Amino acid sequence: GSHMSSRHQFAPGATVLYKGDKMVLNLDRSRVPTECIEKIEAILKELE
Amino acid sequence: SHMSSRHQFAPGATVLYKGDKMVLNLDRSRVPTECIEKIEAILKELE
């Protein structure tokens, strides 16, 4: 929310909720540049 | 459940896709630092 929030918005449709060590990234493919989504999916693929 | 996908890249790195939304769960105590840093770099350039 607006007060005491662990959620940060980098851009519309791109937010991160911090939960200590764990974090949740919400990415809206209708709003976040496709290039950004692909770069992130590429990084995740490498982890595999 | 036919309206989404769930995938695990490594322990502590899983994603849920539903509609236009991509929800990535990252456990930084289990996912390599390099990986987390490259993702953060991408988000910041977006800012």
Q: Which domains does chain A show, CATH number per domain?
A: 1-48 (6.10.140.1550)
Those residues with Cβ within 8 angstroms of residue B2's Cβ, 6 or more apart along the chain or in another chain: none
Query: How would DSSP label each residue in B21-44?
Result: EEEEEEETTTS-HHHHHHHHHHHH
> Resolution to 1 decimal, in Å?
1.6
Q: Taking CB atoms and an 8 Å limit, are A44 and B13 in contact across chains?
A: yes
Q: Taking CB atoms and an 8 Å limit, are B46 and A14 in contact across chains?
A: yes
Name the residue type at position B18: K
Q: Which of A8, A16, A23, A32 to mutate to test the interface with B (most CBs of B within 10 A)?
A: A23
Determination technique for this PDB entry? X-ray
B41: how many CB neighbours lie within 10 A of its CB? 12
* A5 min Cα distance to partner chain B (Å): 18
